[PDB]
Amino acid sequence: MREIVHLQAGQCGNQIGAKFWEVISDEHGIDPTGTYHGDSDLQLERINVYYNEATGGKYVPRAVLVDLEPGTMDSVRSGPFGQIFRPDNFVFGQSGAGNNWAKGHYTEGAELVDSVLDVVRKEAESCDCLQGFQLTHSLGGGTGSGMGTLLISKIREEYPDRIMNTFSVVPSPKVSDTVVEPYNATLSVHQLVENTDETYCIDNEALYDICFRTLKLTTPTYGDLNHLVSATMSGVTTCLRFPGQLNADLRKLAVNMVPFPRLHFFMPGFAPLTSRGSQQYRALTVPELTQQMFDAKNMMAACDPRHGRYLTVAAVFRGRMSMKEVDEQMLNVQNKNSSYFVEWIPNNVKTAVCDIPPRGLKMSATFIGNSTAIQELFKRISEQFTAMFRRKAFLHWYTGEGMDEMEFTEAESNMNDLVSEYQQYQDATAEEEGEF
Amino acid sequence: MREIVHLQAGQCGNQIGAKFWEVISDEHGIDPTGTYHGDSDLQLERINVYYNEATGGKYVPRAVLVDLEPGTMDSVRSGPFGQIFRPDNFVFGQSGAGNNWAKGHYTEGAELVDSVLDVVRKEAESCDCLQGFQLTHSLGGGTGSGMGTLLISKIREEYPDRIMNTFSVVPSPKVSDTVVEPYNATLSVHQLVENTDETYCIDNEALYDICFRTLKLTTPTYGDLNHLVSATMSGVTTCLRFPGQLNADLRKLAVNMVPFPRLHFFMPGFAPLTSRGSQQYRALTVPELTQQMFDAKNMMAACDPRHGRYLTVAAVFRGRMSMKEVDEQMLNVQNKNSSYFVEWIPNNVKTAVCDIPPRGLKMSATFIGNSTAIQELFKRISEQFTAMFRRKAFLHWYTGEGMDEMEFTEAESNMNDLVSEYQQYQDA
Amino acid sequence: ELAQAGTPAPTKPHDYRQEQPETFWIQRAPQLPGVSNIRTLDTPFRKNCSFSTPVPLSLGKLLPYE
Amino acid sequence: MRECISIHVGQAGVQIGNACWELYCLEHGIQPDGQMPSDKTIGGGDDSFNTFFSETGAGKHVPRAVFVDLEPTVIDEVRTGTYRQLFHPEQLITGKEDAANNYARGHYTIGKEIIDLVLDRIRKLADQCTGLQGFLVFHSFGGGTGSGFTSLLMERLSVDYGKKSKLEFSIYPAPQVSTAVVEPYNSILTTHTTLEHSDCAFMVDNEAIYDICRRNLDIERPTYTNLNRLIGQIVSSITASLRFDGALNVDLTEFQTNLVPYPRIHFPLATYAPVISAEKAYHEQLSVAEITNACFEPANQMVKCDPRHGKYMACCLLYRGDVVPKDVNAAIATIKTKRTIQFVDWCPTGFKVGINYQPPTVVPGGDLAKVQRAVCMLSNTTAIAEAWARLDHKFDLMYAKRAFVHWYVGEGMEEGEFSEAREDMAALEKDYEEVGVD
Amino acid sequence: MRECISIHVGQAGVQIGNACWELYCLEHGIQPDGQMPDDSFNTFFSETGAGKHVPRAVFVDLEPTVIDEVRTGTYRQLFHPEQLITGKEDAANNYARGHYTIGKEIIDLVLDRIRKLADQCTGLQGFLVFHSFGGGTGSGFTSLLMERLSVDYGKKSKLEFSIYPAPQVSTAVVEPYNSILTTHTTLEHSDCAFMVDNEAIYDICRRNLDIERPTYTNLNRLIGQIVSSITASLRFDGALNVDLTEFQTNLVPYPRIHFPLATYAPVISAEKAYHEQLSVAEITNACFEPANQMVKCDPRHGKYMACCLLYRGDVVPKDVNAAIATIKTKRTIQFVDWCPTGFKVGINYQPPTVVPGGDLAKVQRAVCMLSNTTAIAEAWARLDHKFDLMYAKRAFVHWYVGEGMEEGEFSEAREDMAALEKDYEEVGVDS
Numbered sequence A: 001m002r003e004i005v006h007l008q009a010g011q012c013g014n015q016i017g018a019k020f021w022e023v024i025s026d027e028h029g030i031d032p033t034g035t036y037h038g039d040s041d042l043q044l045e046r047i048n049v050y051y052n053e054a055t056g057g058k059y060v061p062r063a064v065l066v067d068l069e070p071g072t073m074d075s076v077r078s079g080p081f082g083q084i085f086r087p088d089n090f091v092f093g094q095s096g097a098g099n100n101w102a103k104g105h106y107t108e109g110a111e112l113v114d115s116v117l118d119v120v121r122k123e124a125e126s127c128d129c130l131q132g133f134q135l136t137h138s139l140g141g142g143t144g145s146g147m148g149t150l151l152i153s154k155i156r157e158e159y160p161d162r163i164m165n166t167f168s169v170v171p172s173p174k175v176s177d178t179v180v181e182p183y184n185a186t187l188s189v190h191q192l193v194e195n196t197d198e199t200y201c202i203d204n205e206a207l208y209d210i211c212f213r214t215l216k217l218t219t220p221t222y223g224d225l226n227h228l229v230s231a232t233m234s235g236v237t238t239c240l241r242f243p244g245q246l247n248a249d250l251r252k253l254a255v256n257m258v259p260f261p262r263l264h265f266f267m268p269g270f271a272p273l274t275s276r277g278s279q280q281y282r283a284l285t286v287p288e289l290t291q292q293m294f295d296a297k298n299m300m301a302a303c304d305p306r307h308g309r310y311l312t313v314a315a316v317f318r319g320r321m322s323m324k325e326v327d328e329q330m331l332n333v334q335n336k337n338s339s340y341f342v343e344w345i346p347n348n349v350k351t352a353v354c355d356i357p358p359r360g361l362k363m364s365a366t367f368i369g370n371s372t373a374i375q376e377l378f379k380r381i382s383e384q385f386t387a388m389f390r391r392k393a394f395l396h397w398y399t400g401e402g403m404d405e406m407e408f409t410e411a412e413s414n415m416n417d418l419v420s421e422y423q424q425y426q427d428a429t430a431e432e433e434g435e436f
Numbered sequence B: 001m002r003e004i005v006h007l008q009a010g011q012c013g014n015q016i017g018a019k020f021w022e023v024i025s026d027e028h029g030i031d032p033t034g035t036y037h038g039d040s041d042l043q044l045e046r047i048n049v050y051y052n053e054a055t056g057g058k059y060v061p062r063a064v065l066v067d068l069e070p071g072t073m074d075s076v077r078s079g080p081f082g083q084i085f086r087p088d089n090f091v092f093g094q095s096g097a098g099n100n101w102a103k104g105h106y107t108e109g110a111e112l113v114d115s116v117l118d119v120v121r122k123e124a125e126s127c128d129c130l131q132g133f134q135l136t137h138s139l140g141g142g143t144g145s146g147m148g149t150l151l152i153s154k155i156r157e158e159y160p161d162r163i164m165n166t167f168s169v170v171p172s173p174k175v176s177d178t179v180v181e182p183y184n185a186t187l188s189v190h191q192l193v194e195n196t197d198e199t200y201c202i203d204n205e206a207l208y209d210i211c212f213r214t215l216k217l218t219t220p221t222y223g224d225l226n227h228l229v230s231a232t233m234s235g236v237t238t239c240l241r242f243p244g245q246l247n248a249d250l251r252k253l254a255v256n257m258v259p260f261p262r263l264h265f266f267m268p269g270f271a272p273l274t275s276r277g278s279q280q281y282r283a284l285t286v287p288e289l290t291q292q293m294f295d296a297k298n299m300m301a302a303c304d305p306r307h308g309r310y311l312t313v314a315a316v317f318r319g320r321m322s323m324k325e326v327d328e329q330m331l332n333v334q335n336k337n338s339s340y341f342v343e344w345i346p347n348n349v350k351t352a353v354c355d356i357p358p359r360g361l362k363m364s365a366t367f368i369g370n371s372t373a374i375q376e377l378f379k380r381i382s383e384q385f386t387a388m389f390r391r392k393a394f395l396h397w398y399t400g401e402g403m404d405e406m407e408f409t410e411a412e413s414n415m416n417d418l419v420s421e422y423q424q425y426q427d428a
Numbered sequence C: 001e002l003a004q005a006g007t008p009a010p011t012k013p014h015d016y017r018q019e020q021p022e023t024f025w026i027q028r029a030p031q032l033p034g035v036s037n038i039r040t041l042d043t044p045f046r047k048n049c050s051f052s053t054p055v056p057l058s059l060g061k062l063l064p065y066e
Numbered sequence D: 001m002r003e004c005i006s007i008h009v010g011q012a013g014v015q016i017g018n019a020c021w022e023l024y025c026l027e028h029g030i031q032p033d034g035q036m037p038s039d040k041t042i043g044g045g046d047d048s049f050n051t052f053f054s055e056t057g058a059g060k061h062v063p064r065a066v067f068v069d070l071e072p073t074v075i076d077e078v079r080t081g082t083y084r085q086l087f088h089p090e091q092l093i094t095g096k097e098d099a100a101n102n103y104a105r106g107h108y109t110i111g112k113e114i115i116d117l118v119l120d121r122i123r124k125l126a127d128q129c130t131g132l133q134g135f136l137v138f139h140s141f142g143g144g145t146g147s148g149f150t151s152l153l154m155e156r157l158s159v160d161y162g163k164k165s166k167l168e169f170s171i172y173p174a175p176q177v178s179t180a181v182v183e184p185y186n187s188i189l190t191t192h193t194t195l196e197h198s199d200c201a202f203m204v205d206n207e208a209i210y211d212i213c214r215r216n217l218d219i220e221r222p223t224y225t226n227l228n229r230l231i232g233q234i235v236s237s238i239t240a241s242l243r244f245d246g247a248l249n250v251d252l253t254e255f256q257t258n259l260v261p262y263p264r265i266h267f268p269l270a271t272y273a274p275v276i277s278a279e280k281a282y283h284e285q286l287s288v289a290e291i292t293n294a295c296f297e298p299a300n301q302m303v304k305c306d307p308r309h310g311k312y313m314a315c316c317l318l319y320r321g322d323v324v325p326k327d328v329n330a331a332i333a334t335i336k337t338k339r340t341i342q343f344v345d346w347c348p349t350g351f352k353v354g355i356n357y358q359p360p361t362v363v364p365g366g367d368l369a370k371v372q373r374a375v376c377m378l379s380n381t382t383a384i385a386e387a388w389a390r391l392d393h394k395f396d397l398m399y400a401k402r403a404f405v406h407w408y409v410g411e412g413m414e415e416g417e418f419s420e421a422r423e424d425m426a427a428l429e430k431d432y433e434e435v436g437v438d
Numbered sequence E: 001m002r003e004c005i006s007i008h009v010g011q012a013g014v015q016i017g018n019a020c021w022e023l024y025c026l027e028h029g030i031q032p033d034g035q036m037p038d039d040s041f042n043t044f045f046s047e048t049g050a051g052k053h054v055p056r057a058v059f060v061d062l063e064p065t066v067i068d069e070v071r072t073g074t075y076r077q078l079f080h081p082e083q084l085i086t087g088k089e090d091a092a093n094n095y096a097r098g099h100y101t102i103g104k105e106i107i108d109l110v111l112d113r114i115r116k117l118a119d120q121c122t123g124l125q126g127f128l129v130f131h132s133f134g135g136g137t138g139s140g141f142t143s144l145l146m147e148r149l150s151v152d153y154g155k156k157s158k159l160e161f162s163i164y165p166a167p168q169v170s171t172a173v174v175e176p177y178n179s180i181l182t183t184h185t186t187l188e189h190s191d192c193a194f195m196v197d198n199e200a201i202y203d204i205c206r207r208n209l210d211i212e213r214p215t216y217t218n219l220n221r222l223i224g225q226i227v228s229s230i231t232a233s234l235r236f237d238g239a240l241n242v243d244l245t246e247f248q249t250n251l252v253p254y255p256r257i258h259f260p261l262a263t264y265a266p267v268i269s270a271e272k273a274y275h276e277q278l279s280v281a282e283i284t285n286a287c288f289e290p291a292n293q294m295v296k297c298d299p300r301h302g303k304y305m306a307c308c309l310l311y312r313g314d315v316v317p318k319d320v321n322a323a324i325a326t327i328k329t330k331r332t333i334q335f336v337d338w339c340p341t342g343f344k345v346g347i348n349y350q351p352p353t354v355v356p357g358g359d360l361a362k363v364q365r366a367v368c369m370l371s372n373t374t375a376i377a378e379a380w381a382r383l384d385h386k387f388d389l390m391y392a393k394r395a396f397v398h399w400y401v402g403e404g405m406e407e408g409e410f411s412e413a414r415e416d417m418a419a420l421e422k423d424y425e426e427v428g429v430d431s
């Protein structure tokens, strides 16, 4: 009735997507074979949001998995929870992109998109009332950022009056493992700023930082990093699937956050995260969620909001709970932190409450934060791209595939206009009106 | 409701806090695991003043531990009452100061304050009405004095309209076990006099003198010294937790004991101290408490008020008792010694009474005293500082870490002005 | 002087050139992201491409979960 | 499907191929007979051997490699020895007379007779393969066949196969020791076929392996068998991303993107860590942070060149065993803080990281220890410019008096090859200094 | 977490290293294989993926005739084979050979090995340097090893336990040239430096331990007890623990003076251990007696500038403060007028351990003192007399000029020694 079609691009997208379907099948009570083994009756009331009915009482996900290397597709097939996916939806090539954005966007990925859009159209038209799409990919690769941005451009032209989420893994300076990351990054940010409704910046430094000093975790494997990524992406759309006292889906969240269509780069965060040696020393109460949600430790990007200004924020709560404390605690942090919150817009906090908690927890919360402090990542990508493009380094790997040198120049101008656009809104006088 | 945030700085601050949380968890009936195991209802009525609420009816102290060396932190966590503290409250640095005030205050303490001010703001905003703070630190070492003064200097502007207490281990001439100790004492009193509501002077000479003359213990370990000082530190905030016939919180003590804003150096004592041989033979009577207190041996500093004048006097009593004998005896000790009190302040006595006695004891008393005799202490520190600074001794450990020579000059001049201010009330 | 204990006794039989060392990956081999189908008794980290090959250019193999 | 055709040309190529193919058989469980004892009845999910072996209906697995040589005296050891049943009879191409330390003899005179048979066997392997990653070349600069016949081989392979990857494993002449006299002539006339006709080219010299196997593997007098074990260990580590499943997978064209900033600059530096004896493995703690610094240590380099006087341009790291991603980022971090090494200002993040699960194997009678962790590194450095200029001085010193030129002119080539191959090498050295300017 | 990488250079350095590391193994319960039959061992022993503990020490010598019996003896399987660096052709008691000619071929191997041990320290307190002033490798090689370590590592702690030549009996004749030419170069390249003298420890074992026929080995066991008591507070917990930096900053009034004296008490035989009363007052009273000194100089002619006490075992802080109080009143001791309180007190819990075949006995409490004293000038001023007497006719000078050093290095080392003595006296001059 309100269907979200899932899109996975690249090796990083498939590792995230495999854990995401594992975390919400447990939430809805689905065995790896495909049937339903649960204890409540409201788990099947709204299950067509992500699942599609099959014969014999079997549920298959509404996901398509796309890659340019067949090695990942067999791994995500033969994984712990890879049996539930329909084998038609596994679309793949034979030659990899090669950590090259030009191969994925112009030459190699230009032939794979004919097969992908036929499957996407086939799966989206079957919905009675399509709600929107959702994509998980990484900007540091070739088959996720080269061809994932092409999937962005075709879908937005075909389905204009639809809402599209993306979960972009923004590249990181300190734990970078690929030399040509700023080449792949700045050629894709222009595609995400023009043809995407919501963008969430998920960074591997913050996933490592949460797993080190908050969880006190010994070995933070990629499964543990994707465990945090699947947390916010399960919790952001929990008002769609479960009833609550104050319901707000992702479209109502989109209206209350985005003041201008060029400002849609957000920051996620999951509130109730404790370590094994400190959980039984802590009480689970609404002020304890609000304190752990708003500090800069739990932000899932390399952005410190102290340098910037919080533009507009969310809190999506989960659990049976009395929302005086929800209506009081974010007012208290509104009145205290006067400088961090921009005074040009009053009472910018958006509130939603869902009745059904996650499995095994009685209370939980999720954060979405639009801040001007996101512009320091684009400036860091700009300076690393400027310092290397000026010497024409690694350029023959890109200019030999047909794209000329002016695409880089306009990619610089589009990002420099973006970082300046955030800068005017950060330093703007509210109590004045202009020439208009 | 009215909540006190505890601070511990340095090895001495950690040892004095571990014993203090050991004696008031027994006062409020708390097992080593943390669960309440009591016998009355008055104990549970006021717990939020010092403890938080946790899952399963557990209480964790509202305390933060600060150190620059993990060696003392491990012994505190491995002690009898080390499980009750939250592991997030422990803040340690990987490189210590080494009895140096400059390391703790300028270079090494600058990086570590971002975590402590994160943690102390994290749990003080959870108070519905924060009553005040509390600090315990030692001036004989730079771990808890260089940064201990910087923590005071950072918390003052952040929380202006509060009250904070500090328990300073003021160094001694005969128990002087570090050479650069006058540098650590002088440069920290300068910061202490300007940003502190209330100060306490505790000296190890007086703690050794008490356990020798009074308690008759052959081996006075630091646990016995921590027992003696924490019996007063619990004894000063009893009106907040246990109701009495006449209550007096820490702000009510401060308004009657600080007549001028630079005069807040008080020296404490504890009245009912008795040996095991003399325990059978004493009689628990109200004049016995004030006669064992106003004895000059019983004090907890290396100074004598016989050389000075009692500016103001406070007494806090513990136990269900008659207060007519309290008013009679304290008037008697005020009038019989007419030369040890100032002429310009009549009724130099502040009195408080708490019903609930300390555990295992019938009646008790605690005394806070402001007197001119503290300037004897400050001159003793300043005469050793000026006998060793004037030859530029040990100056390369300070002038090479980002400190010019003018900080030493202004530290002497401010201390010279402070003893002159204290001196003018000895005569006038 | 005095008595020194020898090398500790091996709890399990060990032989190099045939034995795979204990790793975190081989401890959690069926539960890892990135691990293909497990049909080998020697190492579970040998690649399987039964699902990845097209319908032409394929020998008759065994698909996973089939 | 993914798979590489490895060619071994020269007497150095055959002897490298023997010690590397005995590693591949032990890694996949292949007997010298060619059969696989495992998968006797069922269990055909294992296809990690598909990159190097071809399955036959009798269970025989033949390698997809060709052995090319002009003298039969070293190739008849392979036809007689313990691996006489594994190799195909027609994949060991044998000439009649050797080039006899001569570029012109093996390029213009003798090298034109067996070229058609080699290109026939390559086409049979190329028609049999379904998806080809690239060609692997194993040869030596100093020999007649390894320089002369190899030079015509890359030009004929470039005309036939255009976009195929061509990796090179060349035995560069050592600076002070060697085994011949006309090595400067043979090593400077082969610069053209390694400049325009090679996608990647790893240089190794024998004496930089000699001191490594003396002071690290604690054996007092190694021989050529011990050199080829360390040389063949790197090729397994490069191709381990294709064969064995891992967390991060690096294709052949994956590290070419991250190590070739310009087409003129495709000369990385190969090194391996750890290289320790079974004596020292009992004593030394072996960790991820302690093996990523052995690659950066100039004493453990495999080319006699010092990166301290050079500067790094790009780096590629390949890990084997239990190397969790936590200690990868912790050890790369402290590499960036130390100022002994230097990076170019136009490459801010110079690292490429690949992680594979399967630890390396050992051989019976071998000298390396059975370890859990390993790392090989391929780094671009300006310190190749000082490696070329040392041999460049010896060539100009020899050519001033015009020695041995009558041995080259009389075979069919002009005398203008010496001056031309000197000039473009000088332009290549002039190229390397300019890129190194900050 | 804490670490202390020792370096041993010279034949005296190897012989001290054998006695020091035998004590370390028996104190921490280490077999010579390196096996355990708790993380106190982590400051000296590195863990291994085989369960072995490898010491954090580097042995350096130009003589192969003393490293081999380390490689052959009881601890032949404990030490890593690359930690025992051995040169060739010796140094032959020459500063010039050990510095300019022979020492420059093996200095790269030592600094590469130091890097391979200093990459394992999350936090390193400092290096300990053991060397002898007399021989060539302890003099020549240590002189430029200090300079290269100061350039490579910025402000890491550098402690010295040097062997100063005895005024009466010694080994060599050219030892004044070797001793002076290092004292000039250990001024600006050393953080702290203790001195031990052989003939005083000969007097100690003669009249206290009742051993009338000792060797270097009975001597070297006493230095090992001192080094153990220095790092005792680092390894094990105590009432008032002390790190390397604390007594390093409590013993230098001025940067030019970093030369304290190390004494030990009690040092008595097993028969006298049954009789004597070992209280903390009776062990601190023996450190002030000049007959129980370790350097042949009397502090009664000098002045105490700073002092550090290291109590070990069944000690009480109450009786320690009483023993300090009774010392401060007598007039045999004398402190300077600008230092009213010169004491630093360290207390450790664990009693010292003995080794079989030793000389000491079961003791419940011990003390090690590090007092900076104005009595050491008579050691340098007499060595100024010995050197200038033998430099007067330029004897043995051609043995030094022949390696490549200028004659003017001798003259500038004389101006450095004169300036160090004229730096020295004004601190002893009262106000």
Ligand SMILES: Nc1nc2c(ncn2[C@@H]2O[C@H](COP(=O)(O)OP(=O)(O)OP(=O)(O)O)[C@@H](O)[C@H]2O)c(=O)[nH]1
Pocket: D009, D010, D011, D012, D013, D015, D016, D070, D071, D098, D099, D100, D101, D102, D140, D142, D143, D144, D145, D146, D147, D171, D178, D179, D206, D224, D225, D227, D228, D231
């Ligand atoms: N690393 C290594 N190099 C080898 C080995 N065997 C031979 N070489 C190299 O081979 C060179 C000698 O020339 P060859 O390659 O044998 O000459 P060729 O390829 O047979 O050509 P011709 O002898 O002229 O017919 C020497 O410089 C060695 O560096 C080996 O086992 N390992």
Ligand SMILES: Nc1nc2c(ncn2[C@@H]2O[C@H](COP(=O)(O)OP(=O)(O)OP(=O)(O)O)[C@@H](O)[C@H]2O)c(=O)[nH]1
Pocket: E009, E010, E011, E012, E013, E015, E016, E061, E062, E063, E090, E091, E092, E093, E094, E132, E134, E135, E136, E137, E138, E139, E163, E165, E170, E171, E172, E196, E197, E198, E216, E217, E219, E220
């Ligand atoms: N205190 C002390 N000094 C020792 C001991 N053994 C040797 N020495 C000193 O070492 C000096 C002689 O130098 P050596 O240590 O024998 O040899 P070296 O230092 O390596 O110098 P070269 O002989 O030139 O190589 C003598 O003057 C002794 O003072 C010892 O056990 N204790």
Ligand SMILES: Nc1nc2c(ncn2[C@@H]2O[C@H](COP(=O)(O)OP(=O)(O)O)[C@@H](O)[C@H]2O)c(=O)[nH]1
Pocket: A009, A010, A011, A012, A013, A015, A016, A099, A138, A140, A141, A142, A143, A144, A145, A169, A176, A177, A178, A204, A207, A222, A223, A225, A226, A229
């Ligand atoms: N958070 C997260 N990051 C991942 C995961 N897998 C890979 N990455 C990151 O993605 C980067 C490489 O992406 P890549 O595989 O080249 O993207 P692709 O080529 O589009 O598949 C690396 O720097 C990894 O840190 C994952 O499961 N979770």
Ligand SMILES: Nc1nc2c(ncn2[C@@H]2O[C@H](COP(=O)(O)OP(=O)(O)O)[C@@H](O)[C@H]2O)c(=O)[nH]1
Pocket: B009, B010, B011, B012, B013, B015, B016, B099, B138, B140, B141, B142, B143, B144, B145, B169, B175, B177, B203, B204, B207, B222, B225, B226
């Ligand atoms: N009264 C008292 N004094 C102590 C205690 N512990 C240490 N001290 C004194 O504090 C001084 C050393 O303090 P130190 O450990 O350097 O403090 P820090 O530098 O802040 O860690 C010594 O002179 C002791 O006399 C204690 O538990 N009680």
Ligand SMILES: [Mg+2]
Pocket: D010, D011, D070, D071, D098, D099, D100, D143, D144, D145, D146
């Ligand atoms: Mg040949």
Ligand SMILES: [Mg+2]
Pocket: E010, E011, E063, E135, E136, E137
């Ligand atoms: Mg010697």
